[PDB]
Structure formats: C-alpha cells, structure tokens
Paper text:
Our structural and functional data provide insights into how LPA and S1P adopt different conformations to interact with their cognate GPCRs, the selectivity of the homologous lipid GPCRs for S1P versus LPA, and the different activation mechanisms of these GPCRs by LPA and S1P. The overall folds of S1P1 and LPA1 are similar with a short N-terminal helix capping the orthosteric binding site from the extracellular side.
On the contrary, the ligand-binding site in LPA1 shows a pouch-like side pocket. In LPA1, the long unsaturated fatty acyl chain of LPA adopts a U-shaped conformation extending into the receptor and then bending backwards. At the bottom of the cavity, W210 (in TM5) pushes against the bending region of LPA. Instead, the main change in LPA1 is manifested by ECL3 approaching closer to the N-terminal cap segment that causes L290 to flip upward from a buried position in the inactive state and to make a direct interaction with the backbone of the cap segment. Additionally, H40 was previously proposed to be involved in the phosphate coordination based on the inactive LPA1 structure, whereas here it is displaced from the ligand-binding pocket by the shift of K294. Owing to the bulkiness of W210 in LPA1, its side pocket can only accept lipids that bend their fatty acid tail backwards such as the case of LPA.
Residue numbers in the entry:
A (entry chain G): 8 to 63
B (entry chain B): 2 to 340
C (entry chain A): 6 to 54, 182 to 234, 239 to 354
D (entry chain R): 23 to 239, 251 to 323
Write the structure that this text describes.
C-alpha cells in the first residue's frame, strides 16, 4: 500500500527537478526546424505527377 | 498515517511542479509564430485503393522502403501490400483471428502482430523454400496487445492492455525490460528517432516518456480529458502529438515539459483513432471516427484539408518515411493512398 | 518486363485463396460466450464437446465457433466492438449464487453485465441465448433460503419453477431493443444432452428470421 | 398469301368489332379511367424509384429487383397512356404499323411486369433457404436475371410485331385484337398461368420451410398474410383477362367485345398496385417517402 505511494513519489521527484526551458525558446526551435525542412516535404508542397510513383 | 502524508507531499510536489511549468511559460507558440501567415489549403486525392480484405482493418504500418505496407484484418489475415503495383505481395493466415496491431521491422525481414491472444507473434519473411511461418511467439503479457514496434531486428517494444509496456528480446523470448507507471490500458506507443526514448499513451488520459536503456519514466504529460488512442513523435524528436477520444489533438514539448498547443474544431466531436506528422512536421494528420481524416497546420492549429474516401470508421493512418503519400485504413475492409 | 508480370499471377492466386477462405468462414456460426466467471460456462464448454479460447463443434450439418474471453481482465469498452457481427451471444448465469455474495450479490453483478452487453451500442441486432446453469443446486438450495435475498420485491412460494421463471423474467426485462433481438432462455439440463440441440434451434431461428428480413418478407 | 394493303377498317369489319365513328359516353369513360390509372401508376413508380435511388440502404439485390419492377410498371403506365388518345374514334386513323406498335408496347410492358414478379419470387425463395447470417451479395446474378427478364419481355412483345400476326390468316383472327392471331393469345395466356402457379408453389415451399424450422423454437401469421395477398393481387387482376382470351380463342360466338377494355384496365391496375404491395411492409421505404 504505502510502498506504491513511496515509489510513485520517488519517481515523481525526478520529474520535479528537470531541465525546464522557456516556452519561447521551445517554440522558436520548433518553428526553426519546421521552416528549415519545409522544402523537403512532398505533402506540404504538392508535387507534379511525374515525380510521384502514385500518379502514374 | 504516512500514506496520506506522502500523498500530500506529492500534492506539494505537484504544486511546485505546476509553479515551475507556469514560470517557464514566458509566451505561447500562437503569439510567437503568428508572423508567418497560414501556409494555405492542402488537398490530396486518392491515388490507390487496396482490396482483398473480407472484414474490418484494424491497423497498418509502413516499411522504411516507402513501398511496402502491412495491414491486419479481423478476417484472420495479415496482408503485406505494395502500394505501387497494388499487388498483394504476402497474405499470412493467423492462428487467432482477433488482431489489433502490426509492425514491419525496419530491417525489412520480419513482421509482428498481436491482439486478444495476449501474444506477440513474430513472422519471418525469409521463406527459403516454404511459405511464411510464425518464427516466434512472445508470451507473458496478461492483457491484449494494443501496439508493438520493432526497436531493432532482435528487440521489440510492446504495449498491452494490462497497463504496462515491455521490451522483449526475440531470440531468447523473455521480457528484457518492463515499463510500469500507467494506471490505464496502454493504447498506443511511439518510438523516438534515435530509439533511446519512447512515448506511450494509455486510457488514463496521460502520456509517459520512457528511457529504453534505463527503464525509468522521465516525464509525465497530462491535459487530455479522456483516453489517448494515438501518439506520434515530432520529426525533430523534442515534441509529440497525442490524439484522444475527447475530439482533440495536443502537441506537447519535451524540453518545455508542458502542453505546447492544441488542435480542436467545434465542428468535430468524435474520437481520434490515429495521428501522424509530415516529414517536415508542419502538417498534422488525424484519423477520426467521422469516417474522415483531418489535416492541421501544426504551428498554428488551422485545418488545411480533409480526406474522405471511406464508408466506415477510419481505424489507422500513417505517413511514409519520405512523406510522399499517406495511408488510411478503415472498417470498410479497404485501404487508400493519398498524394 | 519478364518477371514483373509473373508475380502478378502469384498475387492473383493469393487473392482467389482468400476468397475460398472467406466462403468457408461464412459457412460457420459464431457465438460469443460471456458470464461472470463462476457462471458455469465450463460445464457448457464441456457439454459442447491466457488470452481467448475457441471451441469448434459440429451438429446436424452445421458448425459453431464459440469464443470465450473470460481471461482478459481489462476494460471491456476497448475490445468489445471486436465481436460486432457474431451470430449470437451465449450468456451464462449460475442460479445458485443468487444468495452468496462476492458487499454485492453475484446475481446483481450478473444482471449489470447483462444490461451492459445486451443494450451495448455494438450489439443491437445480435440475439442472446441465456443459459441458467446450476439447476438442481439452486432447486435444493431454495428449499431453506428464500428468493428475497437478491430481489426484495418478489412475492410467492420458495420453490423451483416459480423462482426460476421469476429470474428468467427479471433477466429478460433488461432488454430494451425488444423489436430487434430476442432472448432464447433455457435452463441447462445435465443428462438430457440437448443443450447443443437448443443452440442449434436458436441459431436456426435467428438465421431464418434474418433471411426473411433480407427480403421483403419481414 | 397475306394482305398488307387494306387498313384497320377492313380488319375491324372482318370481326364484330366497331370503329366508333366519333366520341361516345363509353369512350370518354374509358379514356378518363385509363388516364387516371396511368397517372397513379406513373406517380407511384416514380416515388418508389426516387426512394430507392435516394437512400443508400436500398442497395441490395432484392431492392434492385424492386426498382426494376417499378421501372417496368412505369413503362406499362406510359404504354397505357399512349394507348389512350389513340383508341376509340382515333383508332380509325391508325394504320397497320402503328396498330402493331401500340399492341406490342402493351404486351412487352405487361410481360416485363409479370417476369419481374416471378423473379422477385425466385430471389425470395433463394434467400429464404440460405443457412448463413450475413452473406455478402454481389451484382452478378441480379443483373443477369434482370437482362434475361427484359429479353423475354422484348421477344414476347416483338414476335407478333414481325411475323406472328393474323394478317396472313384471315380465317383465324382474334376478336379483341383483330390483327393478332389466336395462337399468340394462347401462348401469352399459358405463359401468364404457368408463371402464376410457379409463384404459388415457390411461396408455398417458403411457408412450409419456415413453419417447419420455426415450430421448435409471430412469423407464421405475417408470412401467410404476405404470401396470400401477394398471390391474391395477381390472381384477381389477371384471371378475368386470361379467361377472356381463352374464351375468345376457344368458344366461338362468345360475346367478348364487351368485357375487354375493363379487363385491360384491371390488368393495368395490377401494375398500379405492384409498387405498394412490395414496399408497404418495409417501414423504412415508407419513411423515405416525402
Ligand atoms: C382482355 C384482357 C387482356 C389483357 C391482355 C394483357 C396484355 C397481353 C395482350 C395479349 C394480346 C391480346 C390482348 C387482347 C386485348 C387487347 C388489349 C389491348 O391493348 O388492345 C386495346 C383494345 O381494347 C383497343 O381497341 P380499340 O379501342 O377498338 O382500338
């Protein structure tokens, strides 16, 4: 009974102390990586029919 | 009376955890990345339809080759298709007709599946001179096998309805590692690019990040009001999206350790059955019980298309490792490729 | 393009094979066995002859696949829809446990599970065959214990036929789709060896009624 | 040895039929009742067709046969409409070609209707005896027998349109269809009769099977009602006309020119009733109507 709560607290205290970063920096890195690879995405930019094996 | 006082110690730990999560909330993605206007509307047309299943399709998964895929049907069959020539390359009859997951073993040589049998069946596709035969059967899970993904050619990560995950070694056949901490049925799992961490979503409305080597839980993410049916990693590897039965997707960031953004439309109120990203991560596709799949702009949470070619519940959705197309499978016994 | 066209026929072969399997899979009855653990379903499975157990048996040029999922121990809401389309649901209930409690009397738990399964949104046109097991045990038990332990509103003598019919009705009342499905009840007999015959008759009735419904005859 | 020079006047003079110089009370009566039955037929069959092609629930072989029967009955209604505005005094202006065309249209429409009834019966008999629950259905046999139905109808309506006519046999000419011959009347009557008795036997076997395999476990009352009314509509609509044809071909000096138009009106009322007899039971079809 108490052992369950003890293990849960021990595992949660590791989550308590964690390398937290500002949401601003996380969003900036997300946007940077998303716009850097924007060219290599076929779905983002519909490609013509001869370049896709599914067209013909 | 130490149990309740430790419960309140956890209460205070959560109080200061929420305080720190708010302290790091300097701004929001919506305020920051608004300078870039919407990317525009996307429209993808069904370029193929794979027939042959005589019952509901419950799962699929793409191979790293970007040409072959696998699907499991309630009729008791596991079919490996080729999406180019739409020719059924393999058709495996299973011992138990009740299957719910698939996996293609990026090595390209093995496949796996499982379900109400509580077993993970591994099928080898070498077939020197005989038809495909069950190569191994991993037993030990006490609940149905909800998801499974080959971490390597000899290791496999499995999620079960018994509220735990397990890393198995195929050769020996025992649970090399066990992952506990979820209080509900683990419904989905997703591996990271490097294979050093993986995120699992369960019916307890929670997603947990797990270290494969260490075996512990690093961070816990919450915010969903109901069961998480699907989960996918962001291509960069520092974020992940979760789809739930509360008609909503949610993008969480690892480093931030908090809910980054949400994707929900007042028009859609059904459950989400699958989620995926595009190779660039901008587009977030989500399969729904509405018989259709919705596209979202990850950075701004704006619908940017819809896929409608199925007459029944869209059960599985996937995007190839090249991002050239998308595969959808539904209970109507048919699959479809888009773009 | 020498062998790129060869594999095609192989593919086609697979295809045709699938079809045949489908046909065979369509020529067999599908029954889902449900119960509250100690409902006496073991006796039924025996008289017909971890994970999910399958029992095949033939009778009068007909075939039956019975699926027992009693060893799951998980939230049923996630996998129950997997049985949408079975020919019937055989639901077992032990009459003896009307008085013994697991708190909660096992009969109330059985009625709750029955209400959940019958009125489930995935089982709206599937018929239920109710098997009330432990006939003689329950009969000899009520000779000293009233039926008022489970249902406090019952009124009458404490004998086998009356209380048996009372429990039959109490289980049949939980149905709400009174126009879409039926409930074939049968108190399991030990030495008569006719339970498989009752299942055969119920499945035949269900099949014929669905046939008449397919066309404009019902 | 045939005559294709003289017009309808000579043929009607051969037998006892009259040309109806100009309008008459009976003429207006028959025209009105005919156009009424035709309006009813067309409206009901159009309603049935739009209901079947609007809701997707009605996308199965039995509903395909029901829609085919609706189309056949609509065709018969329009054929009876075209028959009006040309009979009575207008018939005097018709010629041999147009006469044969009109009669062949009538014959082919009604034969298609009868064949569709028989095919519905056959598919019901087939479906009632399968020992499967779902039985995923295809589109092969339904369209096969549908094209066979329309082929039988077209051939039975065209045979007399080319060679099987009493033009070449002045001695043996009908008394209701002056140009047709008694042999064709006998053929059509025997066809109708055998089709009806076959339907009767099929539905009786269905009922016996259901009775035997349901007694051990109400369906019997509803099945008996459906079968008895389905057969009764057909019999009470077609028996007088078949009797009239048989009397014409068999009994000479039998007064048959009096009860021909009314018996035709009844035969068409059969198609008027067909759409509701095969669609009133399905409450979904009724709900779809709006
Ligand atoms: C008597 C009821 C017969 C019902 C026949 C159903 C269709 C099968 C027809 C087989 C050929 C024999 C039909 C003989 C009756 C004629 C039916 C008909 O369509 O002709 C209309 C006729 O009055 C018009 O006469 P006029 O007004 O003098 O031109």
């Amino acid at each position: 009974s108490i052992a369950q709560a003890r293990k849960l607290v021990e595992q949660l205290k590791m989550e308590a102390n964690i390398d937290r970063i500002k949401v601003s920096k996380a969003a900036a890195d997300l946007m940077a990586y998303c716009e850097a690879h924007a060219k290599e995405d076929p779905l983002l930019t519909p490609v013509p029919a001869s370049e896709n094996p599914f067209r013909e | 009376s130490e149990l309740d006082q430790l419960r309140q110690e956890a209460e205070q730990l959560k109080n200061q955890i929420r305080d720190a999560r708010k302290a790091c909330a300097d701004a929001t993605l919506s305020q920051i990345t608004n300078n870039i206007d919407p990317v525009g509307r996307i429209q993808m047309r069904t370029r193929r339809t794979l027939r042959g299943h005589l019952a509901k399709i419950y799962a699929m998964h793409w191979g790293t080759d970007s040409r072959l895929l696998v699907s499991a049907s309630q009729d008791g069959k596991l079919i490996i298709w080729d999406s180019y020539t739409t020719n059924k390359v393999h058709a495996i009859p299973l011992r138990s007709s009740w299957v719910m997951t698939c996996a293609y073993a990026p090595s390209g040589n093995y496949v796996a599946c499982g379900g109400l049998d509580n077993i993970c069946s591994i099928y080898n596709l070498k077939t020197r001179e005989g038809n495909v035969r069950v190569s191994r059967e991993l037993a030990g899970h006490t609940g149905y096998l909800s998801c499974c993904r080959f971490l390597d050619d000899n290791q496999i990560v499995t999620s079960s309805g018994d509220t735990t995950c397990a890393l198995w070694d195929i050769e020996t056949g025992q649970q090399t590692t066990t992952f506990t901490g979820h209080t509900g049925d683990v419904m989905s799992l997703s591996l990271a690019p490097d294979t050093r961490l993986f995120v699992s979503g369960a019916c307890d409305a929670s997603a947990k990040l797990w270290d494969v080597r260490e075996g512990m839980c690093r961070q816990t993410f919450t915010g969903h009001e109901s069961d998480i049916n699907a989960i996918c990693f962001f291509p960069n590897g520092n974020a992940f999206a979760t789809g739930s039965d509360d008609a909503t997707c949610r993008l969480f960031d690892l480093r931030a350790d908090q809910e980054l953004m949400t994707y929900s439309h007042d028009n859609i109120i059904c459950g989400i059955t699958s989620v995926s990203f595009s190779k660039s991560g901008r587009l977030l596709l989500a399969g729904y019980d509405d018989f259709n799949c919705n596209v979202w702009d990850a950075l701004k949470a704006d619908r940017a298309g819809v896929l409608a070619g199925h007459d029944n519940r869209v059960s599985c959705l996937g995007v190839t490792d090249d991002g050239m197309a998308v595969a959808t499978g539904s209970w109507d016994s048919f699959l479809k490729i888009w773009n | 393009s020498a062998e790129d066209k060869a594999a095609v026929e192989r593919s086609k072969m697979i295809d045709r094979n699938l079809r045949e399997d489908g046909e065979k899979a369509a020529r067999e009855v599908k029954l889902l066995l449900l119960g509250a653990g100690e409902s006496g379903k073991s006796t039924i499975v025996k008289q017909m002859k971890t994970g999910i157990v399958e029992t095949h048996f033939t009778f009068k040029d007909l075939h039956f696949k019975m699926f027992d999922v009693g060893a799951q121990r998980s939230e049923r809401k996630k996998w129950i829809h997997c049985f949408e389309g079975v020919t019937a649901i055989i639901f077992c209930v032990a009459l003896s446990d009307y008085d013994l409690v697991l708190e909660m009397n096992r009969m109330h738990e059985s009625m709750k599970l029955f209400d959940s399964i019958c009125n489930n949104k995935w089982f709206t046109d599937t018929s239920i065959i109710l098997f009330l097991n432990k006939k003689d045990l329950f009969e000899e038990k009520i000779k000293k214990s009233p039926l008022t332990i489970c249902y406090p509103e019952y009124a009458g003598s404490n004998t086998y036929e009356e209380a048996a019919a009372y429990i039959q009705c109490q289980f049949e009342d939980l149905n709400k789709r009174k126009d879409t499905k039926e409930i074939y009840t049968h108190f399991t007999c030990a030495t008569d060896t006719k339970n498989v015959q009752f299942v055969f008759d119920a499945v035949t009735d269900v099949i014929i009624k669905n046939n008449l419904k397919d066309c404009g005859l019902f | 040895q045939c005559f294709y020079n003289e017009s309808i006047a000579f043929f009607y003079n051969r037998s006892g039929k009259h040309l109806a110089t100009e309008w008459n009370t009976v003429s207006k009566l028959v025209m009105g009742l005919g156009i009424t039955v035709c309006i009813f037929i067309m409206l009901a069959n159009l309603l049935v067709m739009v209901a079947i092609y609007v809701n997707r629930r009605f996308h199965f072989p039995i509903y395909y046969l029901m829609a085919n029967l609706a189309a056949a009955d609509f065709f018969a209604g329009l054929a009876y409409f075209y028959l009006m505005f040309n009979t009575g005094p207008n018939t005097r202006r018709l010629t041999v070609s147009t006469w044969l065309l009109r009669q062949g249209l009538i014959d082919t429409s009604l034969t298609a209707s009868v064949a569709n009834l028989l095919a519905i019966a056959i598919e019901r008999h087939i479906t009632v005896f399968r020992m499967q629950l779902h039985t995923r259905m295809s589109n092969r046999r339904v369209v096969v027998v549908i094209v066979v139905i329309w082929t039988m109808a077209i051939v039975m309506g065209a045979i007399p349109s080319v060679g099987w006519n009493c033009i070449c046999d002045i001695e043996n000419c009908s008394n209701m269809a002056p140009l047709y011959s008694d042999s064709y009347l006998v053929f059509w009557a025997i066809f109708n009769l055998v089709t009806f008795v076959v339907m009767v036997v099929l539905y009786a076997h269905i009922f016996g099977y259901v009775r035997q395999r349901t007694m051990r476990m109400d369906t019997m009352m509803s099945l008996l009602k459906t079968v008895v009314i389905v057969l009764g509509a057909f019999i009470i609509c077609w028996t007088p006309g078949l009797v009239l044809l048989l009397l014409d071909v068999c009994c000479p000096q039998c007064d048959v020119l009096a009860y021909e138009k009314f018996f035709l009106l009844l035969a068409e009322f059969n198609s008027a009733m067909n759409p509701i007899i095969y669609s009133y039971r399905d409450k979904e079809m009724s709900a779809t109507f709006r």
